[PDB]
Amino acid sequence: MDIKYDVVIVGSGPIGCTYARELVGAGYKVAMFDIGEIDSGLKIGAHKKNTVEYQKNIDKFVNVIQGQLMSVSVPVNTLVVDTLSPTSWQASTFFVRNGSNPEQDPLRNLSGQAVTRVVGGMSTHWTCATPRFDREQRPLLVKDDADADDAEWDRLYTKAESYFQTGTDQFKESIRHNLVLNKLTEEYKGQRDFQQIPLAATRRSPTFVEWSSANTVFDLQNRPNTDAPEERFNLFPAVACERVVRNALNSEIESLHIHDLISGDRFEIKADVYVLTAGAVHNTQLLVNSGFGQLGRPNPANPPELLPSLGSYITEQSLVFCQTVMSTELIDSVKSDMTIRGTPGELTYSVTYTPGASTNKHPDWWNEKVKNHMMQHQEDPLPIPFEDPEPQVTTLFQPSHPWHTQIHRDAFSYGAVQQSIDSRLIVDWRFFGRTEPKEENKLWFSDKITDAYNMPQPTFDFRFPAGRTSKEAEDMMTDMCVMSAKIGGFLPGSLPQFMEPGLCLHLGGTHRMGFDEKEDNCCVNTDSRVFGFKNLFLGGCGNIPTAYGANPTLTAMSLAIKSCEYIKQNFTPSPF
Amino acid sequence: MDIKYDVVIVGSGPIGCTYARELVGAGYKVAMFDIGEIDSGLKIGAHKKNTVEYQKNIDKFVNVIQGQLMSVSVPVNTLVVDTLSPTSWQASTFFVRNGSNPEQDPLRNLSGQAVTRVVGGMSTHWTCATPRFDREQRPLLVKDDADADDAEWDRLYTKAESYFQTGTDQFKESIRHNLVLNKLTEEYKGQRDFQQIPLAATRRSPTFVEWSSANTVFDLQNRPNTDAPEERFNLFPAVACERVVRNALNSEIESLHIHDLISGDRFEIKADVYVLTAGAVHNTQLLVNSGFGQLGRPNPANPPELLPSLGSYITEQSLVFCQTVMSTELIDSVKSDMTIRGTPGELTYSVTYTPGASTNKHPDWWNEKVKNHMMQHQEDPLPIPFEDPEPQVTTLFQPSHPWHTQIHRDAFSYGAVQQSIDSRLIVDWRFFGRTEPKEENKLWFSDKITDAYNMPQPTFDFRFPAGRTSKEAEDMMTDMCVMSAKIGGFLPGSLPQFMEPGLCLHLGGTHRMGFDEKEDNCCVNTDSRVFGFKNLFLGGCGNIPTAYGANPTLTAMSLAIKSCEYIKQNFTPSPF
Amino acid sequence: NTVEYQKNIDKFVNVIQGQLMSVSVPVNTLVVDTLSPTSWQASTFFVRNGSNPEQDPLRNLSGQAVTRVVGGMSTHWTCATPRFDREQRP
Amino acid sequence: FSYGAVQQSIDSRLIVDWRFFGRTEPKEENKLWFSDKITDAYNMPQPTFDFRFPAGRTSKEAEDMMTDMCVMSAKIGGFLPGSLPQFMEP
Numbered sequence A, B: 001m002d003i004k005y006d007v008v009i010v011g012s013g014p015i016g017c018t019y020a021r022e023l024v025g026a027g028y029k030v031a032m033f034d035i036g037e038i039d040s041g042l043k044i045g046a047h048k049k050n051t052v053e054y055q056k057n058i059d060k061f062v063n064v065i066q067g068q069l070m071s072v073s074v075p076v077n078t079l080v081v082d083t084l085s086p087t088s089w090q091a092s093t094f095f096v097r098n099g100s101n102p103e104q105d106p107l108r109n110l111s112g113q114a115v116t117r118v119v120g121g122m123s124t125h126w127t128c129a130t131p132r133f134d135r136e137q138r139p140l141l142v143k144d145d146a147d148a149d150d151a152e153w154d155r156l157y158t159k160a161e162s163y164f165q166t167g168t169d170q171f172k173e174s175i176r177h178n179l180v181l182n183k184l185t186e187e188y189k190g191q192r193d194f195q196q197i198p199l200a201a202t203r204r205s206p207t208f209v210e211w212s213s214a215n216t217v218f219d220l221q222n223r224p225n226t227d228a229p230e231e232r233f234n235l236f237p238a239v240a241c242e243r244v245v246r247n248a249l250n251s252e253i254e255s256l257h258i259h260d261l262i263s264g265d266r267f268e269i270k271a272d273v274y275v276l277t278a279g280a281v282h283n284t285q286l287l288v289n290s291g292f293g294q295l296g297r298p299n300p301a302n303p304p305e306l307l308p309s310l311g312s313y314i315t316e317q318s319l320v321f322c323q324t325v326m327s328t329e330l331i332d333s334v335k336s337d338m339t340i341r342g343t344p345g346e347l348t349y350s351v352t353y354t355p356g357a358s359t360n361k362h363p364d365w366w367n368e369k370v371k372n373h374m375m376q377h378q379e380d381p382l383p384i385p386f387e388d389p390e391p392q393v394t395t396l397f398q399p400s401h402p403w404h405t406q407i408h409r410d411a412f413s414y415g416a417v418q419q420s421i422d423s424r425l426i427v428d429w430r431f432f433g434r435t436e437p438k439e440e441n442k443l444w445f446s447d448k449i450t451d452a453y454n455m456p457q458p459t460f461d462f463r464f465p466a467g468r469t470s471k472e473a474e475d476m477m478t479d480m481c482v483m484s485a486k487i488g489g490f491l492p493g494s495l496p497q498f499m500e501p502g503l504c505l506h507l508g509g510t511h512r513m514g515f516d517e518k519e520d521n522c523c524v525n526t527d528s529r530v531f532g533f534k535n536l537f538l539g540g541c542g543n544i545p546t547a548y549g550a551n552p553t554l555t556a557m558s559l560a561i562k563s564c565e566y567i568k569q570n571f572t573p574s575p576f
Numbered sequence C: 001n002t003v004e005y006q007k008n009i010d011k012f013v014n015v016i017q018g019q020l021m022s023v024s025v026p027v028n029t030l031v032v033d034t035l036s037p038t039s040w041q042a043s044t045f046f047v048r049n050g051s052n053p054e055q056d057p058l059r060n061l062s063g064q065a066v067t068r069v070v071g072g073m074s075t076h077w078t079c080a081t082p083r084f085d086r087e088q089r090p
Numbered sequence D: 001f002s003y004g005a006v007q008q009s010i011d012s013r014l015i016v017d018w019r020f021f022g023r024t025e026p027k028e029e030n031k032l033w034f035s036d037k038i039t040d041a042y043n044m045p046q047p048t049f050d051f052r053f054p055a056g057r058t059s060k061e062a063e064d065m066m067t068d069m070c071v072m073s074a075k076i077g078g079f080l081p082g083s084l085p086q087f088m089e090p
């Protein structure tokens, strides 16, 4: 712990690590603080799902996700338990209890919102879907030249894809993937296009996908080390970053207040450049705790003088979900090229096909796997191989279907009844709607109540806006129903539903980006620099000022790359 | 990966690490293999619950436990789902599916049995309760001299307590602990004694308990290193140990077959001494896969010639559970020494007490905390401070109450209704019965079906024995009901119940210890040496041949210490 | 058509449930393994609790039920009486 | 309808029921038979079903019908949690 660094980064999630990669590599002397701890093995900040045991027991991983999502704001519980024994002590009111936030209106909450405090942040458990935004979802980096703007985003996204190792080829030989993809491609021919979900992942074997993480962007090892003898990087875990100290004119940050959670000591760290990548909730908390915006219940007139748009225009996506059980038509089609004689397990049973036949619907590799599976497992009534990877299908957001789609399999805790249904049959559907940015939709912080780290307690005042956002959310539900029906019926216990607000964890706009602070009601410019400040930058989904449905991390990373280019343009690294 | 070591240990759980500590410290050249991976941060094999974030959100840790318990044997699912859409594909039978074990009779299972594959084993998530066994629960180490036998166990347990850092003082200043403890102590005066649960843990602060683990016994760092320049230790994670190679006479093990799960390669490792500490299930699997006992459905006559008792006489404990909501009597007693005037939150409200008064039921420290809490939180109707640690109470197994008891709080996923009840009110009750060892109670392995690591698939043939075990299990339920009623009524949603067989994870007797292989129907002697073998040793709960209710790990560790003394007596470490 | 049911209409669901007796119930094969060790338990899922051993549970009309009362099912029915068009009609 | 305690949170005036009924093609293999061995509570031959919804048109229309309910219901409001679109038992 030196007192002085070239750059300090708050947060070791994938966006913090974007800054670290860019800036450590350019020869800045970098310090990174995370309030969480190293928690993912010897590869610091790696995806927890890359253990052999999780790749063999993938639904167990749902626990790992649940175990590191701590709810942001829980309303007072008013549920009546009246089957207590008469001896049991009971209050006469539903008092503030069990860590609930008394400031939170339960009917204006993002109840599903949660944060993760670990080195690697949420990239230690995330799903790895990294789609680009098209124009209608994306903030402008170049004013009045849409082709220039596209070009800039294409460069940024290409580099971001490189960092995350995004690809659309890891599932190309899956029977289930191809089955679902083909059917949808045919059913929406000339209307929608389908492809593999772009995933930040590298296949290592037919049963092992190394999911990308923060560690993929930046290995988080202290430097100089053998591999980077000329780089300077330190990671300080278990450090609560509390406050950035503003100069009088609000033109520079002078230091960072940190609290070492293991020793209990509080220090100040100085740096030329301060980067806040603490997540959409906690960047905001840190800023509000440093005298940006305003502490307390926003009151209608009496706006904050410093960054009045901070924590306003917040967006979270609507998320609809179901599972389906694959249709008979689709299962039969798997084995459409086979001649099947006799009945399974009897002496006369056989399954054959003619390789290369021009009337075959599938290529030989498909038919070989099916035939082998059918002959070698005559106790199994399904023609799909047991280790066949899962479907990873999308039709990306478009003006005529303005929502993101994932038609796939993720870890899931199946109920005992649903466990009756063979897993090969099951497909997950998650559709994500875009939410219009509205001033009245806020994340604020209590001036009285604190969180578990003694920081101002976040509170939401949010409803999905009326008009287009709501109407599209209901069209999106309908679209999932219509689309899913082409693949199979719903799985009982996983019928079409909206998920609780904020469960998708795609919160944006909390510290939002634009060209002009006043005219675009924003907090950072397109370099992610906080307006007025020479050396303060915010990274992450909180910057995104638009209505978007697609998964936002790639877009956040792209903005972070641009922010880093700025820092390289304006700050000299110190002599080594 | 050298080809030759002095000692090889299979498994990096707390019992493997007992061997490592003993033998690495004595100057043996030690190799340790675990099929799992490093997963608990930079302190290898540490308790996952020792992060600041888990100590602030303790119920989240239930997910961490669930996420690393993989079920040993799951029967074929026969549950009817008949609300599928008519288009959905459905089999005509309940075929073998979703990793279920077709060999497993669902009505003779230990359905709750699960294993953990991670460096540190189950000690990365365990509850840390480390009680001694009294004579009636404990195997004999010394024949025909009960005082000699006691002395030997006392020495072994003392050292085991040292390794685990077991104490009974970490909760001494908890209001809730003292409340429950006092009430029970008074109610069973002259009949039962109560104390703190002996816990393998060190308190670091009033809100932080560093829970012990494998890492506590042995830090698992490769050696020689700076701290131990003269020790030789290597840990090889992600290595499936498959088979121990027996000589012709069954008098020596010649090598260990290993499978590197990252490279895919298979090697043989040689050693003077082989120690198997893979857990009660997997020690047995490894032995059966090496030609000990017999593969397949045990058939009634046609016993295995080599270690015929292996996987017979298995014991698992009965576990009963409830939660209670603290009585009015008990809550009022917290504040019995206070004068309370007015009504909370009004100008005239006050709470006072006279320090040192001889008629006070509590000591000044209790009364100060209560008074302060009451005055400073007048919105809170309870007199218990918010960060008051949890109760950690037991009455240890005795002949007149032959079950272990824990009256405490562990991580729990509270339902939304139960979340209505203030957490300070809630106490967990878990009572554990002893199970008589019976020949017909078996763990066997399929000769046809394999597990996720391609090893013979474990299958249970178990029922809790008739007679004493069953009768005591029902008395134990009754005792929990009677005892819990003294503290409060049951919490709805957590009413008194038996847990599924094997959920307690205290499986024993699978490779059981005794003096004489034939006369005590056992597999290892009191040095934990496998009968006939000069250089094969088994560690862990599988050795315990008795009916026990208390948590077995301390007893296993004690046996491992004795086994290590033997190894030191008979094997020379190689020159460094 | 009682005043009390017209004032508490959702209570009438009970009246319907109380006179629908299932036509054919398959043998129950559900595992209960949280019984006390003292409780008596069979070793198989034997024919039990009025289940029909002839019924394949995966070829059933599990929701089929009959009503035995004067008035039959018209004592509880919903009263919807649409005509069939040609394509539905004999 | 027996509303669950959560669904009882939603004002009844808001709630609309949707029930769509599909037609089933008559097929020879779809049978109601009676046991020659087992009897019912009135000692009469025990009914037994051998039924599946037929393949082809009946199934396909049943799934279009589900879809139609989803599409149509969306014009009136969102689904009520606890009463999400589902097939009822046969």
Ligand SMILES: *Cc1cc2c(cc1C)Nc1c([nH]c(=O)[nH]c1=O)N2C[C@H](O)[C@H](O)[C@H](O)COP(=O)(O)OP(=O)(O)OC[C@H]1O[C@@H](n2cnc3c(N)ncnc32)[C@H](O)[C@@H]1O
Binding pocket: A010, A011, A012, A013, A014, A015, A016, A017, A033, A034, A035, A036, A065, A116, A117, A118, A119, A120, A121, A122, A123, A125, A126, A127, A128, A129, A130, A239, A240, A241, A242, A277, A278, A279, A280, A282, A283, A286, A505, A539, A540, A541, A551, A552, A553, A554, A556
């Ligand atoms: C949990 C989750 C998240 C996502 C997916 C699925 C699941 C279940 N799926 C997904 C996501 N995003 C994608 O684009 N596609 C996918 O398929 N998920 C969200 C994604 O994971 C996040 O958008 C992303 O990590 C954001 O990265 P970030 O902006 O770097 O933020 P993180 O939350 O990852 O990490 C921040 C970080 O900083 C710390 N912290 C917080 N407060 C403080 C303070 N005051 N001081 C110091 N450090 C602080 C944390 O401990 C944390 O590590």
Ligand SMILES: *Cc1cc2c(cc1C)Nc1c([nH]c(=O)[nH]c1=O)N2C[C@H](O)[C@H](O)[C@H](O)COP(=O)(O)OP(=O)(O)OC[C@H]1O[C@@H](n2cnc3c(N)ncnc32)[C@H](O)[C@@H]1O
Binding pocket: B010, B011, B012, B013, B014, B015, B016, B017, B033, B034, B035, B036, B065, B116, B117, B118, B119, B120, B121, B122, B123, B125, B126, B127, B128, B129, B130, B239, B240, B241, B242, B277, B278, B279, B280, B282, B283, B286, B505, B539, B540, B541, B551, B552, B553, B554, B556
């Ligand atoms: C999960 C759990 C366990 C316990 C508690 C609570 C919970 C939820 N509470 C508890 C326990 N015991 C106590 O005495 N008191 C407490 O309050 N729990 C059980 C305790 O945790 C176990 O008894 C103990 O770890 C046993 O230690 P061990 O005999 O060293 O076995 P482990 O299972 O911990 O680790 C073995 C290990 O070896 C590996 N392995 C398995 N098979 C192979 C093969 N073939 N090759 C190589 N390595 C193998 C694993 O990966 C594992 O790490």
Ligand SMILES: *Cc1cc2c(cc1C)Nc1c([nH]c(=O)[nH]c1=O)N2C[C@H](O)[C@H](O)[C@H](O)COP(=O)(O)OP(=O)(O)OC[C@H]1O[C@@H](n2cnc3c(N)ncnc32)[C@H](O)[C@@H]1O
Binding pocket: C016, C067, C068, C069, C070, C071, C072, C073, C074, C076, C077, C078, C079, C080, C081
């Ligand atoms: C229960 C139900 C039924 C209908 C509606 C809703 C509910 C929950 N809604 C509905 C119906 N039909 C409509 O067209 N529109 C609506 O909105 N329901 C069905 C309708 O109720 C039936 O189709 C109709 O009653 C048929 O009338 P039925 O052919 O006269 O048959 P029932 O079942 O009403 O009565 C027969 C009757 O005979 C007796 N019985 C049976 N076995 C014997 C023997 N062996 N011996 C002597 N008597 C016997 C019964 O006791 C019964 O009363």
Ligand SMILES: OC[C@H]1O[C@@H](O)[C@H](F)[C@@H](O)[C@@H]1O
Binding pocket: A127, A128, A129, A406, A410, A430, A503, A504, A505, A506, A551
């Ligand atoms: O359930 C919510 C999550 O689900 C996944 O399917 C997505 F990939 C995510 O982007 C999102 O956070």
Ligand SMILES: OC[C@H]1O[C@@H](O)[C@H](F)[C@@H](O)[C@@H]1O
Binding pocket: B127, B128, B129, B406, B410, B430, B503, B504, B505, B506, B551
């Ligand atoms: O629930 C089962 C477990 O519960 C705890 O309370 C005990 F400490 C354990 O020894 C045991 O494994």
